[PDB]
Amino acid sequence: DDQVFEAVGTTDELSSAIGFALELVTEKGHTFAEELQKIQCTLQDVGSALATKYTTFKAGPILELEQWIDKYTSQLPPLTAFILPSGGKISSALHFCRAVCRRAERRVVPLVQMGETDANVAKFLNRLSDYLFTLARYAAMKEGNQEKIYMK
Amino acid sequence: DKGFSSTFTGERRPKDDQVFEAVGTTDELSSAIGFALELVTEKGHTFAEELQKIQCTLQDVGSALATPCSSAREAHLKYTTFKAGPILELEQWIDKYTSQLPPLTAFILPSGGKISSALHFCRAVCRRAERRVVPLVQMGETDANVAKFLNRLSDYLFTLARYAAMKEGNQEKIYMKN
Amino acid sequence: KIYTKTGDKGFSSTFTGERRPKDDQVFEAVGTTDELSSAIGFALELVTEKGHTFAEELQKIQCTLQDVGSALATPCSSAREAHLKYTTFKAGPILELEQWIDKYTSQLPPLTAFILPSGGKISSALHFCRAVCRRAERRVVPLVQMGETDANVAKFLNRLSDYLFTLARYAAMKEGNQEKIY
Ligand code: B12
Ligand code: B12
Ligand SMILES: Nc1ncnc2c1ncn2[C@@H]1O[C@H](COP(=O)(O)OP(=O)(O)OP(=O)(O)O)[C@@H](O)[C@H]1O
Numbered sequence: 001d002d003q004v005f006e007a008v009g010t011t012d013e014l015s016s017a018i019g020f021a022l023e024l025v026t027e028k029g030h031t032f033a034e035e036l037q038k039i040q041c042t043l044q045d046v047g048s049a050l051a052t053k054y055t056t057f058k059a060g061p062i063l064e065l066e067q068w069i070d071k072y073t074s075q076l077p078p079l080t081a082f083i084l085p086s087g088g089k090i091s092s093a094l095h096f097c098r099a100v101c102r103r104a105e106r107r108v109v110p111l112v113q114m115g116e117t118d119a120n121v122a123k124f125l126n127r128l129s130d131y132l133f134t135l136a137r138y139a140a141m142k143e144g145n146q147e148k149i150y151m152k
Numbered sequence: 153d154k155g156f157s158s159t160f161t162g163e164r165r166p167k168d169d170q171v172f173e174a175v176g177t178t179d180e181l182s183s184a185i186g187f188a189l190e191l192v193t194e195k196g197h198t199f200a201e202e203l204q205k206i207q208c209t210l211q212d213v214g215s216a217l218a219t220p221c222s223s224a225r226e227a228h229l230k231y232t233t234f235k236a237g238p239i240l241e242l243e244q245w246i247d248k249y250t251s252q253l254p255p256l257t258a259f260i261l262p263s264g265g266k267i268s269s270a271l272h273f274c275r276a277v278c279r280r281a282e283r284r285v286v287p288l289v290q291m292g293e294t295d296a297n298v299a300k301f302l303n304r305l306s307d308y309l310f311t312l313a314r315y316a317a318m319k320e321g322n323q324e325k326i327y328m329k330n
Numbered sequence: 331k332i333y334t335k336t337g338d339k340g341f342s343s344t345f346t347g348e349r350r351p352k353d354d355q356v357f358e359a360v361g362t363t364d365e366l367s368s369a370i371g372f373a374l375e376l377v378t379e380k381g382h383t384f385a386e387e388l389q390k391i392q393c394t395l396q397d398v399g400s401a402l403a404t405p406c407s408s409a410r411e412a413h414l415k416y417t418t419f420k421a422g423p424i425l426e427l428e429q430w431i432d433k434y435t436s437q438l439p440p441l442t443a444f445i446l447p448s449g450g451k452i453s454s455a456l457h458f459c460r461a462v463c464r465r466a467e468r469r470v471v472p473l474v475q476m477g478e479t480d481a482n483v484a485k486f487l488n489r490l491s492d493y494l495f496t497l498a499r500y501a502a503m504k505e506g507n508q509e510k511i512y
């Protein structure tokens with residue numbers, strides 16, 4: 001079906017964007033680079049899961065992401081408004097990765113609502129967007145960059 | 153719910169609604185512009201300020217797209233009506249750059265320095281957003297000025313790409329048949 | 331002024347004079363093609379040094395993608411409704427792409443594994459180009475199922491994805507980056 005190819009291509013697109021983003025880390029040894037590579041592998045797993053009456057998609061990564069998300073929010077100031085995308089090359093590419101990921105979630109949702117894919121796949125992509133947002137904020141913080149908010 | 157989410161007026165729709173594709177593509181555009189902006193190394197450039205104003209305006213179109221006219225109460229009025237001011241700004245800025253650029257006579261390929269390339273990418277993403285917003289406008293659900301703004305933003309990003317290539321002294325590649 | 335405002339109400343022109351809404355399948359394939367070309371254009375500027383052959387090949391693909399856009403914007407049905415010519419797409423670029431694919435393929439270690447997009451900035455950037463190129467192919471195949479666009483256009487997008495993948499492996503190899511596996 002053409003819906004499935006669209007889901008798999010958009011998940012591929014997400015993974016490739018994360019790959020480019022990762023190439024933006026200058027110093028090695030950053031734990032979130034390890035996390036982004038684990039996410040790339042999980043993304044290959046959701047791409048396999050989408051091609052099938054639907055295959056079982058392990059719920060493990062969902063908890064992993066949630067744990068990482070709590071880890072980074074614990075170090076961040078409370079955010080209460082919309083931020084403009086910025087805050088270092090890493091943070092910007094991660095916000096682009098975030099938006100691409102939400103496009104992927106929209107491409108997967110019809111398949112889940114039709115019974116052709118495990119709901120855990122959409123749940124994983126939904127939480128992956130929140131992880132991408134919180135991580136962008138954390139990278140901007142660790143570089144000492146503004147985090148510009150607009151309101152009016 | 154999972155698979156579902158809400159509009160600013162309280163309508164709960166499945167995550168693949170026209171409005172969610174619209175606001176998400178508006179988000180993708182704002183973020184592409186964000187990376188492009190992180191590519192200006194030298195500070196004080198006025199077009200950095202312009203791209204940031206555009207990011208704000210885009211957050212405003214995001215609110216407009218998330219408030220359908222068919223469900224907009226009175227309190228929501230200030231979001232359904234999208235004043236045309238930002239559009240005029242774009243027109244003015246384009247005129248500003250056009251007086252500084254050589255006359256354009258051929259098809260340009262995306263090129264001309266990292267900023268210029270990033271802006272051509274942003275333009276393509278902008279036109280995708282325009283395609284995702286037009287269905288809402290032609291249905292009566294979002295102010296036409298939003299599509300008008302995105303349509304002019306495509307031309308702004310194009311002339312800005314050209315200006316950046318000029319100021320870096322990089323020469324755009326021209327389309328060549330065969 | 332360079333803008334006309336004839337698009338301000340959501341409508342636009344194909345190359346046959348027809349006026350369709352901006353969300354039409356032809357405009358979706360033309361835009362996705364436009365986008366792929368711009369992504370290749372940005373990748374083209376991660377080349378550190380001068381005079382790479384694959385940079386010339388990419389700029390050429392860009393030209394060919396302009397020609398793809400032109401073709402896609404000329405739907406065959408409106409071509410016989412408007413008494414226009416046939417608007418063909420030649421096979422030259424596909425055969426060329428296949429040649430370049432062979433040239434790189436023959437130089438890199440075989441691969442049995444699924445690789446993660448990575449391998450340096452050029453490599454990862456070309457993998458992004460590859461995903462976008464596939465999206466273009468997916469936007470074009472409905473147009474050929476309906477008989478509006480020559481099927482060579484789809485085939486060329488499909489061998490362009492193969493070209494970009496093998497070029498990313500080739501860039502990763504020449505850099506000494508190793509593509510990550512899992
Ligand atoms: C879904 C799918 C995709 C999805 C998602 C895959 C993912 N998990 O990330 C997307 C769109 C991302 C994709 C991309 C690609 N894929 Co694909 N894909 C498939 C498909 C349908 C199943 C893959 C899968 O998930 N299997 C289950 C998981 C668990 O597989 P796996 O056990 O780990 O092992 C696989 C690989 O080792 C591969 N393998 C086996 N023999 C060979 C030989 C060669 C030369 C290669 C390269 C790989 C390979 O096949 C195994 C089974 O799928 C297969 C077709 C099939 N085999 O039925 C093609 C297939 C594996 N893909 C293929 C290709 C060509 C590619 C791309 C290079 C295409 C491109 N231009 O983008 C890229 C690879 C880049 C990358 N690594 O990201 C070819 C590989 C053979 C070849 N001619 O090179 C296959 C066999 C399709 C075909 N019939 O030609 N793909
Ligand atoms: C449409 C929409 C979007 C659109 C864009 C809207 C825009 N203008 O840019 C898109 C899809 C881009 C989006 C993205 C995000 N959003 Co949103 N979005 C909404 C929605 C449905 C309406 C927003 C709106 O335009 N309101 C009107 C404008 C004028 O309000 P405003 O005065 O400027 O004030 C708003 C902000 O202060 C916001 N706010 C309150 N708490 C928080 C917390 C955070 C972290 C943020 C970013 C904002 C925020 O709430 C106010 C009213 O909406 C609201 C839900 C709702 N309000 O019913 C969710 C909502 C604001 N979004 C939310 C989230 C989580 C996000 C994302 C982080 C999602 C993600 N993981 O990527 C990003 C943030 C992007 C950014 N800041 O750059 C949460 C925020 C609260 C929370 N739980 O943390 C909400 C409340 C939805 C929810 N129940 O989870 N969003
Ligand atoms: N948002 C878009 N996405 C994809 N293709 C488009 C889009 N808008 C226009 N097109 C196609 O590309 C061509 C150039 O678009 P262009 O923006 O120059 O004109 P327009 O938007 O129709 O009118 P205006 O001059 O008011 O912008 C059009 O003739 C049409 O083929």
Ligand SMILES: C[C@H]1O[C@@H](n2cnc3c(N)ncnc32)[C@H](O)[C@@H]1O
Nearest residue numbers: 102103105106157158159167172176
């Ligand atoms: C923050 C707001 O974004 C919207 N929203 C929820 N999920 C997605 C998605 N995957 N893509 C785009 N927009 C989404 C909802 O309106 C939510 O309230």
Ligand SMILES: C[C@H]1O[C@@H](n2cnc3c(N)ncnc32)[C@H](O)[C@@H]1O
Nearest residue numbers: 005006008009463464465466467468
């Ligand atoms: C690697 C797998 O990708 C699938 N495939 C082929 N073309 C596309 C495309 N444009 N987008 C997404 N998936 C595609 C094939 O079915 C193949 O098995």
Ligand SMILES: [Mg+2]
Nearest residue numbers: 303304306337
């Ligand atoms: Mg236009």
Ligand SMILES: [Mg+2]
Nearest residue numbers: 307332333334
């Ligand atoms: Mg024009």
